[PDB]
Design a protein around this ligand. Structure first.
Ligand SMILES: [Zn+2]
Ligand SMILES: [Zn+2]
Ligand SMILES: [Zn+2]
Ligand SMILES: [Zn+2]
Lengths: 213, 214, 213, 214
C-alpha cells in the first residue's frame, strides 16, 4: 500500500457507495452536531469509530501523543472549548491504550528529540505515583501507568476553565476515562466518571485509591 | 445512543473479531510502524481509515480544529517530530474537508470564545488571498478557502525545522495536501505535494496560481 | 562579573537603600496596580524602565524572542488577559529594537534549532511585505522589517479575543507600537496607535501605507 | 503619568547619556553576548538589572505570569534554547518574588478567565506539597509556595531536552533558583543550583527537604 493505492482505493470506495449505498452520504448531510468528543492517542491503534460503532459525524476527535490534556496546550484546549461551548457535546471520552509507545517512551526515556518535552508530562505522573507503582510487579507497571495517565488527564480536563464554567452554569457534560487492550479491543472503564466538580474530585480520588493496595 | 450503548457495541465488536477475524489482533500484536501521518480536522466527517481503506495501525494521526499546522503549536509539532524522526513515516497527508465548520466560523467570525484565537490563523489566509478570493463567485469562496488553508498548512509544515532537517539529511518524506466533500467522499489532490525544499516552494506557488485559473 | 558578584552587588545595594533611601521600598508597598503592559524582546538591550523612567511596579512586562504576539501563544496571551481583564492596564506598548538578533536571524535563516520555528512568524512578515521591502535600498530593509514586525504584532494583539471583548464592552485600552535604536535610545512611535476596533484597522493600514512609496 | 510623559522622559534620558555617559551606546554597539538568562515574573517588582547591578546587554530576559517554565510552553523553551545554544549563556536564573499576585491567585482561585489555566501549574505545586505546607503556620504558606514554585521550575528547566543535551555534551550551563521580597529587595538563594543531571536531582531533593526543617 503506497500513496497511489490510497487515492484509487478512495475513488472506488466512493463509487461503490454512490452506486450501492447512497444513504451513507445522505446520513452525513442530515447528520446533526456530534454528541461525543473523543480525545485519544495519535497511535490510533484501533480507530474510535470501529471501537464504539459510532457513525461518521457522531463524534468530534482530538488526537496527540499519549492522549494528553496539558493545562496550557491551546491546541487541545481549543478543541475542548469548541466541543463544549459551541457544539455542546454531552460526553467527553479520554481513551488511552495499553502498550502505547508514548507512555513506554516516557519510562525508558530515550533521547528522541523534541517529543521528549511533551512526554515529560508523563514522567511526572510516573514519579507522582512512585510508591503506588512500586508496590506492583514489574510487568504491570506500564499498563498501570497508562491507566494513571488517563485518570490524570480526566482530572486536568475537569480543572480547566472550560469545564469549570460549564459545570458552574449547569451544563450537563460528563467526562469518561477509558482504555483498551490490544489483545481484545475490549474497552475498560477507569471508573472516574465526572458530571460536576464534586464527582470530579471524589471519582479521581477513588480511582487512585483502587490502584493502591 | 448513550454511553452504555457504546460499551455494548464495543463488546459485540470484540467478539465478532476474535471469532471471525482472529488475524486482526495478531496483525496489531506485531508492532509494525505506520508509514503515513494523517493531519485532519476534529470534525472527522468521514474517518480517515474509511476514506483510504488503511488497516488499523497503518496511520499515525493528529486532529485539531481545521487541520492547522501552526509554526509554534508544540502539540502538532510533537506529533510531526515523532512521526518523522522516530516512526520515520514516508508520507504526511494534511486533509481538509469542504463545509468545514472551523473554516466557516473563521469567516463568519461569531463571538465563540477561546477558539476564535485559533481561528485567526485561518482569517489570516482569508485576507492574504482576498484578491484571488474576490475574482470568484461568492458561493465558491468558502470551498476555495478550505483549499487555500490546506495549501498553506502544507507550506507551513514544509518550513518546520523538522521537515527542513529531514529533507536536508536525505530522509525521503513526502508531504501531501488533500480535501474531500460530503457528497461523495472523493479525495481531491490539491497538487501541492512536496519532497524537498525546491518542490515545496514551486508546488505551493503553482497551487496558488491554478486557483486563479477558474 | 560572575554569579558571586550579583549576590554581593544585591546585598550591598539593598543595604544602602534601607540605610539611605528607605522610601524606595515604601513606594513599592504603596505601589498601586501597574497601568502599563510592556511587551518587548528578550534581548532587552535597554531595559524598559530606564527607557521610559517608570518606577518599579508601574509596568507589567512580557518578553520573548523578537517581541511577538502569536495568535495562539498562551504564554503571551495569558500575560495580556491578566493585564487587561485583571489589572486593567490602560496602555499596552509593543516595543521592538533596530538590530534585534531574532529579526536578523529570521532573514539570514541559519540552522539554529528549535528557535527557528518561533522565528518563522517573522519570515512570514518578511515575505508578506516583499515588494514594499524590495523598493528600498538593501541597508534599510532590516530596520524596516523590525518596524513591520512591531506593526503586525500590534495588529495581532488587537485581533485577539482579549482586546476584542475589552473594546466591545467599552474598556479604555490603548495599544502602541514603538521601536528604539541603539545609537540614541530614542523611542520612535510607529503611529499605529489603536483605541478600538476602528482605529486598529485604520492606523495599521496607514502604518503599512507610510512605509510604501 | 500618561504616554506623552514617557516620551519626554525618554528624550531627556537619551540626552543625559550622549553628553554625560557617551561610552554607553558604544558599549552596546559592540554586540557582546549576554552571559545570563533571567526568567522572572511579569510583575517585575524590582527590575532585574537593578536587583543585580548588571549593565544593559548583559542579560537575556524572559517574563511570564509567575515565572513558569512549563515543559511544553514553546515561548519560554524558545528563549531557553536560543540562550543556551546560540548565545551560550553560562547561568540561568529563575527568580520568584514573595507576595507574587500570580501565586496568590493560584491559591485563592478567583474566576479570572483565561489566566486560570496558566495558574493550574501552580495549583499543582500547592497540592503536591500539601503536607509540607500544612506542617507550617498559615501565614508562612504563601511564601513557601513562592519558593516551592521556583524550585519546581528549576527542576522542570533541568529536565528540558535543551538542558539535558547541553549537560550531556559538556556545555557549562549552571541553573539557579532565587527569590526576593519587597521589604529589602534582598536576593535569597533557594539552594537548588544545578550544573548537571546528578546535581539537579540532589539539590532539588535537598531543597524540598530543607523546607521541612522550619
Ligand atoms: Zn499511544
Ligand atoms: Zn472541519
Ligand atoms: Zn531583540
Ligand atoms: Zn509575580
Amino acid at each position: 500500500k503506497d500513496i497511489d493505492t490510497l487515492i484509487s482505493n478512495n475513488a472506488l470506495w466512493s463509487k461503490m457507495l454512490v452506486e450501492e449505498d447512497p444513504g451513507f452520504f445522505e446520513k452525513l448531510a442530515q447528520a446533526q452536531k456530534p454528541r461525543f468528543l473523543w480525545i485519544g492517542c495519535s497511535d490510533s491503534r484501533v480507530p474510535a469509530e470501529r471501537l464504539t460503532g459510532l457513525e461518521p459525524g457522531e463524534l468530534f476527535v482530538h488526537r496527540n501523543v499519549a492522549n494528553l490534556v496539558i493545562h496550557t496546550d491551546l491546541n487541545c484546549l481549543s478543541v475542548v472549548q469548541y466541543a463544549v461551548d459551541v457544539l455542546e457535546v454531552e460526553h467527553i471520552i479520554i481513551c488511552g491504550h495499553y502498550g502505547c509507545g508514548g507512555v513506554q517512551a516516557a519510562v525508558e526515556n530515550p533521547e528522541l528529540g523534541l517529543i521528549n518535552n511533551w512526554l515529560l508530562h508523563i514522567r511526572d505522573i510516573w514519579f507522582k505515583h512512585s510508591s503506588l507503582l512500586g508496590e506492583m510487579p514489574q510487568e504491570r507497571r506500564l499498563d498501570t501507568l497508562c491507566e494513571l495517565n488517563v485518570m490524570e488527564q480526566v482530572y486536568n480536563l475537569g480543572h480547566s476553565t472550560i469545564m469549570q464554567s460549564a459545570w458552574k452554569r449547569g451544563q450537563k457534560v460528563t467526562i469518561h476515562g477509558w482504555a483498551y487492550g490490544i489483545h481484545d479491543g475490549l474497552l475498560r472503564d477507569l471508573d472516574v466518571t465526572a458530571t460536576n466538580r464534586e464527582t470530579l474530585e471524589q471519582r479521581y480520588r477513588h480511582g487512585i485509591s483502587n490502584l493502591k493496595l
